[PDB]
Amino acid sequence: SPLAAYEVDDSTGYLTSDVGGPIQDQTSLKAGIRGPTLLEDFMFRQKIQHFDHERVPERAVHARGAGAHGTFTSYADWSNITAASFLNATGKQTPVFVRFSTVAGSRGSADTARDVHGFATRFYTDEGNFDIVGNNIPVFFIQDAIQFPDLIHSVKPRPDNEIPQAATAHDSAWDFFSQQPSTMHTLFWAMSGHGIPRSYRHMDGFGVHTFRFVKDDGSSKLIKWHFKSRQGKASLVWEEAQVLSGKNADFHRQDLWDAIESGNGPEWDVCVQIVDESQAQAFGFDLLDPTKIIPEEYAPLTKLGLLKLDRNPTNYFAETEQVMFQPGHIVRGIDFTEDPLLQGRLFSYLDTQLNRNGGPNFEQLPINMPRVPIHNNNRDGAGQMFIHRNKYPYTPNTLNSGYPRQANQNAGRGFFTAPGRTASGALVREVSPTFNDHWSQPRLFFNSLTPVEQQFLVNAMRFEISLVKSEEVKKNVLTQLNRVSHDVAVRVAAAIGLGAPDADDTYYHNNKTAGVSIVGSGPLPTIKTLRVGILATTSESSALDQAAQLRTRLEKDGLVVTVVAETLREGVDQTYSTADATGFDGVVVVDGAAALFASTASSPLFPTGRPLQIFVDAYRWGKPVGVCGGKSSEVLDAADVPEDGDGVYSEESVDMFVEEFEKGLATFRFTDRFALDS
């Protein structure tokens, strides 16, 4: 913790200026008790000036996000495939910092927007900082970095009025998607449940690009990075995400914070797919193309180590806001590929930190510093924090005895470009013909989802495209969807009253791939941290008694339990007024409370119908719901919830109720409650 050396404690002591002079900061200096404020009030000005300059530009993308500290532990000595020092011994531990994010919204936008999500991991290795700046979706919208402002301008708010915030549901985005068909693969992922994850802990991370692992002998293999969640994969449903955006814009950052504080810090297996250089085009697409995945059937995952997040930042601004990641932060044993999206990224991340930091010495901020000595001839610049002793900062020199020395493949453990890499041909601004198949892999992805997942994706597209005003853009969108799947274009067209174009089967096929479905990936492996809302009443002393007994039983198994009542008191966490179904992964009514759910309910302490609305919403959104007490039928009738439904629980016995209700939590969503196209 270079973070702990820079920590500042203010738990005792008298207020000082920034130069250590004790002062006051509550009243301005004035000429007389009702007089004007004086220019000589240095206390006033130092304080306001600091306030007035507190903000810094938000990131150009991924502005909305949150971070945590942890550790990476290697499972083996990986010398045989990479020279990377953080992977060179069983059990070797490296500190990490991770930031998760959306792409499109500004700071302050809602966590539960539909979007691609960032998953950026810094490894503070003993041979330098290494960053993997990935996303929760393994493919990207575009095939060349020069198009990135085009993609981003199209998805961000229309620039006359700056509407809409954090959403692709507008003409410009679908105009771009429909004119730039490379977008189809990422679009399909973003329109699935991968666009609205349950939490940062319930998504995967991917490096997206093919990279190289380079051995000390100089041989190389091609790799893709996969961070596979140990919490399982899980999504919201859209109608739930929308309400969550309003009720709790901070949902994902709160979830992450709380999991870490409770001792449930999330984990991922850090994995690679590893293939030979000769396989760059063996799989029916080009490994230089970031719109393509390698099916796991062609290349299995190898598990390199464990990533665990287990500590929250001390100061959000200083750590999370100021962390400045770069794919250029590379270490010996890793190399780039000629992926034209990766290639341009290298430029952008060094440049953009000048905007954020306002000066060139951004690598000296505590969160950006390495954990090894720095020896170089970089000097001066605004905000220079070091006092360099070497007064001959040039190479070659004799007056500093030739130091710092050059590092390279054979000296000082230098980074070196993989020596088998070559280039040949004309200097061109031309797209490789090997990149031209934009529709096959979207179809592979779509084929690999379950029927209800396919319906959710169609429904997401129906939602967004129905909000596009241009009839031409809508037609063009159907044209592109039709090339992936005639069925998708037909079902989407039905919602927007246009006809789909005739089937064009060039890229149609029936193939599937493992591991891309959320709903298909079986029950969650753990239910720790999941949220249960127990709906109770201060009316009946039996209701708070039953709530307390359920609480014990659920908290035993690591669930986070919230007892809801009309008013706060001992045992009650939340009022009906502040409660919502978006707040819980499952809801239980204690039978003691059945009168609150009648249609003539009414209280000055919460909005009309709130108790029942929580229960109904939770049911309609596919959550496990139940009534505990043995007079269940009255609440279930008021809800129009069938007692015999999957994921509906009714028991008098607390112990039997809990046992089945917990199986429901693992199932997580009951997908039989959602209507499917015929």
Interface with ligand HDD by CB under 6 A: which residues?
48, 52, 59-62, 65, 99, 101, 118, 120, 133-135, 140, 145, 148, 208-209, 290, 323-325, 341, 344-345, 348-349, 352
Q: Does 170 bind Ca ion (CB under 5 A)?
A: yes
For residue 62, the partner it binds in its own copies, Ca ion, ligand HDD, none, with Cβ less than 5 to 8 A by kind, is: ligand HDD
Tell which positions 538-557 bind its own copies, by CB under 8 A: none
Q: Is 141 annotated for ligand binding?
A: no
Between 35 and 522, CB nearer to its own copies = 35
User: Distance between CA atoms of 32 and 555, rounded to whole angstroms?
Assistant: 61
Residue 129 · residue 95 · CB < 8 Å:
no
How many C-alpha atoms does 577 have within 13 Å on its Cβ side?
8
Q: Is 140 annotated for ligand binding?
A: yes
User: Distance between CA atoms of 642 and 620, rounded to whole angstroms?
Assistant: 12
Between 63 and 270, CB nearer to its own copies = 63
Q: Is 235 annotated for ligand binding?
A: yes
Axis crossing angle, helix 471-484 with helix 486-495, rounded to the nearest 10: 150
Q: Is 148 annotated for ligand binding?
A: yes
Residue 654 · residue 555 · CB < 8 Å:
no
Residue 524 · residue 230 · CB < 8 Å:
no
Between 148 and 211, CB nearer to ligand HDD = 148
Q: Is 539 annotated for ligand binding?
A: no
> Minimum CB separation from Ca ion for residue 24, in Å?
25
Give, as one character, the DSSP assignment of residue 52: H
Tell which positions 402-441 bind its own copies, by CB under 8 A: 403-408, 411-415, 417, 419, 421-432, 434
List, edge to edge, every strand of the sheet that includes 586-590. Answer: 574-575, 560-565, 531-535, 586-590, 625-628, 648-651
Tell which positions 498-557 bind Ca ion, by CB under 5 A: none
Q: Is 311 annotated for ligand binding?
A: no
Residue 277, CA distances (Å) to 211, 286, 292, 630 in order: 11, 12, 17, 65
Between 147 and 440, CB nearer to ligand HDD = 147
For residue 163, the partner it binds in its own copies, Ca ion, ligand HDD, none, with Cβ less than 5 to 8 A by kind, is: its own copies
> Minimum CB separation from ligand HDD for residue 498, in Å?
32
Between 62 and 553, CB nearer to ligand HDD = 62
- Region of 595 please: left (phi>0), alpha (psi -120 to 50) or beta: alpha
Between 132 and 478, CB nearer to ligand HDD = 132
Q: Is residue 135 among the annotated active site residues?
A: yes
Sign for the CA dihedral angle at 510, 513, 518, 519 comes to positive
User: Distance between CA atoms of 15 and 22, rounded to whole angstroms?
Assistant: 6
User: Distance between CA atoms of 49 and 53, rounded to whole angstroms?
Assistant: 6
Residue from the set 90, 392, 504, 514 that interacts with its own copies by CB under 8 A: 392
For residue 338, the partner it binds in Ca ion, ligand HDD, its own copies, none, with Cβ less than 5 to 8 A by kind, is: its own copies
Q: Which two tokens stand for residue 597?
A: 């759910």
Between 125 and 291, CB nearer to ligand HDD = 291
> Minimum CB separation from its own copies for residue 624, in Å?
17
> Minimum CB separation from ligand HDD for residue 103, in Å?
8
Residue 125, CA distances (Å) to 84, 234, 371, 446 in order: 9, 31, 7, 39
Q: Which residues pair with 205 in a beta bridge?
A: 227
Residue with tokens 């201060």: 538
For residue 257, the partner it binds in its own copies, ligand HDD, Ca ion, none, with Cβ less than 5 to 8 A by kind, is: its own copies
Q: Is 220 annotated for ligand binding?
A: no
Q: Does 358 bind Ca ion (CB under 5 A)?
A: yes
Nearest to 564 by CA among 552, 556, 573: 573
Residue 431 · residue 181 · CB < 8 Å:
no
Residue 307 · residue 96 · CB < 8 Å:
yes
Residue 174 · residue 120 · CB < 8 Å:
no
Residue from the set 41, 58, 150, 171 that interacts with Ca ion by CB under 5 A: 171
Q: Is 508 annotated for ligand binding?
A: no
Residue from the set 125, 172, 229, 582 that interacts with Ca ion by CB under 5 A: 172
Q: Is 124 annotated for ligand binding?
A: no
Residue 481 · residue 495 · CB < 8 Å:
no
Instruction: List alpha helices for 271-339, DSSP H.
Output: 316
Tell which positions 145-164 bind its own copies, by CB under 8 A: 145-154, 157-164
For residue 368, the partner it binds in ligand HDD, its own copies, Ca ion, none, with Cβ less than 5 to 8 A by kind, is: its own copies
Tell which positions 251-270 bind Ca ion, by CB under 5 A: none
Query: How are beta strands 625-628 and 648-651 bridged, if at all?
Result: parallel
List the catalytic residue out of 129, 135, 459, 482.
135
List the catalytic residue out of 62, 170, 329, 438.
62
CA dihedral 586→592→593→595, nearest 10 degrees, is 140
Q: Which two tokens stand for residue 24?
A: 């006051």
Q: Is 356 annotated for ligand binding?
A: yes
Q: Does 377 bind its own copies (CB under 8 A)?
A: yes
Q: Is residue 62 among the annotated active site residues?
A: yes
For residue 208, the partner it binds in its own copies, ligand HDD, Ca ion, none, with Cβ less than 5 to 8 A by kind, is: ligand HDD
User: Distance between CA atoms of 647 and 670, rounded to whole angstroms?
Assistant: 6
Between 89 and 605, CB nearer to its own copies = 605
> Minimum CB separation from its own copies for residue 44, in Å?
5
For residue 170, the partner it binds in Ca ion, ligand HDD, its own copies, none, with Cβ less than 5 to 8 A by kind, is: Ca ion
Tell me which amino acid residue 385 is.
Answer: M
Give CA 534 to chain center in angstroms: 29
Q: Which two tokens stand for residue 252?
A: 């994902």
Q: Which residues are annotated as a binding site for Ca(2+)?
A: 235, 363
Q: Which residues are annotated as a binding site for heme d cis-diol?
A: 59, 62, 99, 140, 148, 349, 353, 356
Q: Which residues are annotated as a binding site for heme?
A: 349
Positions annotated as catalytic residues are: 62, 135
Binding site for Ca ion (CB under 5 A): 158, 170-172, 358
Q: Which residues are annotated as a binding site?
A: 59, 62, 99, 140, 148, 235, 349, 353, 356, 363
